[PDB]
Design a protein around this ligand. Structure first.
Ligand SMILES: *[C@@H]1O[C@H](CO)[C@@H](O)[C@H](O)[C@H]1NC(C)=O
Lengths: 431, 430, 437
């Protein structure tokens, strides 16, 4: 859609608006099964070599079944992403539970099984090795050799991925679940029509946010749980907040005070509140849609958005940190770049065909990506995002000029506007 | 075994007891060798397949060139230093020849290196034998397939080493098969109790092992597999869960917070306590916790007193202060800690019965008995359904003992005594 | 070369000198293309099974094309693949793939001038349209082919496409390091050789191809007009052979008997330092650099540009030209730092801190405070219940004797728990506390 961005000179921050939400709120757990076979000349020797790989893969999966679960980011909660999948896997260890799946997939490769614990799970049979080995390889004991290696390949690959990932893999590979299997799983998933179209148009993002959990191998059946994301929040407004240090620009070194907004990250409207994602690298952006997981979020009142327009508003205590580290840095935003230039650092913005077109002076400034290709801060070169969108420069006096350095708390790790004001009042009273 | 858990309302923390230790204290380094060879429509497939072998050897030669809350207090070390030491020995003249001669008659031998380390040495793939007897005279489609199967493991080993800078972890089944690993464990010069432990957790051994690409010389490809030795076994371990503890005043901006920063895994070890500040560095198998002592801090055993009496004089319990009253939850072994502040909706529900506990402002705790999920704001967390008894130790939140006008807020890494010291300095000025 | 190291007892820090720089400063973007074909008995089942893998890989690549893209907290925020994504955005323009398609008609290697002006080297590393249209089209248009060699030849020919699709699928279309399937050694060396760079840069990249792979990105881009194109982003080393040094720091605390009365001080400016264009490139997280013997490969994106006077903090932490960065606390836990030619040991409380030889046992027992031991005769360092191995690399260590600067401060007014402070900031806070008295 229409992505916009506003830079606030007063607080050295920028907000990118125009995004749509796709927040993970639930999990769909499906049981993927592979039917195995009960096993007690140069060409035939190749079959036994390939058959030993099958026997080793089963043994490795048995050993694998034993060892298996069966800025403000430090404020996040502690949870287990695969807990719902582990619950389905625990049920499969009950007596007769695997037989239910085995009987449901006797005539077809796709059925809905109601487990004993009550969970109704869609179950696939993606590879039938019992059918192949018992009917094609059992009576014998070059086309058979080649056909066997291709058919047996998927079991070997699934075993390798599970082995080097403690039985839990993410993203879900095409060997764990092919595109046709995943798309058909999405189509028959008991979800909204908006969710079906969303997941179908973003199959890769679904893979990256899914888990494959090695579960059980019993009664000639290998079963693993594929945990797919359910996006219960769709098409609500999201915005990304970029922050950078804001310092005074006094010439004499060591007399400068700094202030940095610590509330950077992704913000999305969610159920009357705002889901705040402090580590923006945990979200995946597709054009104008941002895919996040609510497990990596903090639930904040919607008034937190007021800190972008008025950092001194009384309705929300805007979070900042203070220091005297006036080092130069840059933040590449969605439609531009924030440049915090201090000291003797060379800060420029250049175009690919013409060289330097803007020289940044001391302080915090901003340039849009229109006509700009790269930004240099010191000895480092940064490439700006070339995505289309309008940027708006909101002129304002840097709020750091409002503070007296003699009483400014110049080392607050995780403070706020009111917290700094309270400390100033205590220091001024002593004077 | 018997997993128990105690929640301390006074300090907003919980301890899960009943675990047994398995701490990595040493390394066993083994030298894994693959013997290499110095080098029609159907033969065109062989020459294409032979180039894959030739490129993998060339790639390994280029690879040989490139030689191999309180977590910020951890020490700086190299996990593969012991394996690299063995790899440095293999570059000496005649050192590879000893391994080459020791594996002439068998695929498994114990070689004493020049530096003194006695290492078990495997020959897992013999390509010189295959190439010299079947492919040398030729330069039958069955031979082509036989070559691809024999050469497959070398391509995979080269592939894994290439995208991992020559050091891979966990050790894949291509670096070391289960039979090779089990036989390596069986002939390892360790106790029979340690052999059974490593054999019953071979995958965990893989996850805590390293494969170090080493040398390719004199028709021999050698890489070092570094297996963990668990020198601390079956000592008591406990996990400490912490969550922010804040006052619950209605008027915004007048609240102070306090959080115990000493969360993580704790295990008894040689008269002291090994403290693992980042609990994600340990692997739990039922009631046994596998950690690496390299990710631990050695603390006096009196650190345990912080759970029963945070104001005890024997240990200065570590805390951090702030005014960030955001709501959060911690899923423990047998329950969940919920820090609910402001206007946040914090509840605990059953899937068939709905909400059974509504958390009020402050720090509280719910056991997993009858509870399936915990909701804090817009986030849903699932509790552990494992069986075990929880004990709720009623207590006045210690944050109520402090005067907010002199309370040192925004202390990044402080302690009980350190906060008291700043309060006395602030009170004296008044 | 000659690696040396100096330990400063006064500040509980060590500097390792003698390294040479190889800093990533720019990106070279090349377009790697694979020409694909438009496609409408026991063996025919094998060919169609292998043909379905080709068709499934193309579909997966299409879905993949749809979804297209101590002081480290002070580092700048950027996108490492922005330059490659910018080139990939150009390839979505009409007729842009056709230009590449026509430019690689006669050769497998050509320089294409894009519409926006960027000149990119373009490779054709695999021609599947040539194989399928000439060998597989007549067979399927009739069936029942009788020599099995064609089936094996097809799967081997199709193998590289399957692997590239697999790596791109489980990595969101961006892979790093660049595998040999994305770009073979022969392809990479020829790409390096024809890269319009200095001969010094060519020799450096050729002798360290693995580091080039590890510092490169492969970005899946577009699949259109029977052409699969992905962008490989290779590192440009614009800073070469300048002096580098690594600064190791450890907490420096007092050793008072009464518990809880001790103050601590730690230099926070640890990391890699390299001379660069009159300033110093400072890499606070040293784990982001790769060391090859005595050459250090870093990426400037993980660096801060500091004035060269920052080096004065190693010889005189109280110098007036640069405000040396420190942090203060009262956390007297024991820890160790393994340096290039030794080990720093901060031993506090009742912890057992020793340095031992495997054949000779303990040769140094550390007392309370911060000390240092060289790797001469030392194999391991033990702090508490943890064992660390020292580097056995040859080199001279110099012990710069000095009284620990923490003894210069009065604990009653010492500003404890300063998360990110400095020498001057601590002095300023002390002066305000002393004025109140
Ligand atoms: C302050 O000093 C007194 C003794 O003078 C001591 O009892 C107290 O614990 C100290 N701390 C506080 C917070 O009062």
């Amino acid at each position: 859609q229409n992505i916009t961005e506003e830079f606030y000179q007063s607080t050295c921050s920028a907000v990118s608006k125009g995004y749509l939400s796709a927040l993970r709120t639930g999990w769909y757990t499906s049981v993927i099964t592979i039917e195995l076979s009960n096993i007690k000349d140069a060409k035939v020797k190749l079959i036994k070599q390939e058959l030993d790989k099958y026997k080793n893969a089963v043994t490795e999966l048995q050993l694998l079944m034993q060892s298996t679960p069966a800025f403000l980011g430090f404020l996040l909660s502690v949870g287990s992403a695969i807990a719902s999948g582990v619950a389905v896997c625990k049920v499969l260890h009950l007596e007769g539970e695997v037989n239910k799946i085995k009987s449901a997939l006797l005539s077809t490769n796709k059925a809905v099984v109601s487990l004993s614990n009550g969970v109704s799970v869609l179950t696939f049979k993606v590879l039938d090795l019992k059918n192949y080995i018992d009917k094609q390889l059992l009576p014998i004991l070059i086309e058979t050799v080649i056909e066997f290696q291709q058919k047996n390949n998927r079991l070997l690959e699934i075993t390798r991925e599970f082995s080097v990932n403690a039985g839990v893999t993410t993203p879900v590979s095409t060997y764990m679940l092919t595109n046709s299997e995943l798309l058909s799983l999405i189509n028959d998933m008991p979800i909204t029509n908006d969710q079906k179209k969303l997941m179908s148009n973003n199959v890769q993002i679904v893979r990256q946010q899914s888990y494959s959990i090695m579960c059980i191998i019993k009664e000639e059946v290998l079963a693993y749980v594929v945990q797919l994301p359910l996006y219960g929040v769709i098409d609500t407004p999201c915005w990304k907040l970029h922050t950078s240090p804001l310092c005074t620009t006094n010439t004499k070194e060591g007399s400068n005070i700094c202030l940095t907004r610590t509330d950077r990250g992704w913000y999305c409207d969610n159920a009357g509140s705002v889901s705040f994602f402090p580590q923006a690298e945990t979200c995946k952006v597709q054009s104008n849609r941002v895919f996040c997981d609510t497990m990596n979020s903090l639930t904040l009142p919607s008034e937190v958005n007021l800190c972008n327009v008025d950092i001194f508003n009384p309705k929300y205590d805007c979070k900042i940190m203070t220091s005297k580290t006036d080092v130069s840095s840059s933040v590449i935003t969605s439609l531009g770049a924030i440049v915090s230039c201090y000291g003797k650092t060379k800060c420029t913005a250049s175009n690919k065909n013409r060289g330097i077109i803007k020289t940044f002076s001391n302080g915090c400034d901003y340039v849009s990506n229109k006509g700009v290709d790269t930004v240099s801060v010191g000895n480092t070169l940064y490439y700006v995002n070339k995505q289309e969108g309008k940027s708006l420069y909101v002129k304002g006096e840097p709020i750091i000029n409002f503070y007296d350095p003699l009483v400014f708390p110049s080392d607050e790790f995780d403070a706020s506007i009111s917290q700094v004001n309270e400390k100033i009042n205590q220091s001024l009273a002593f004077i």
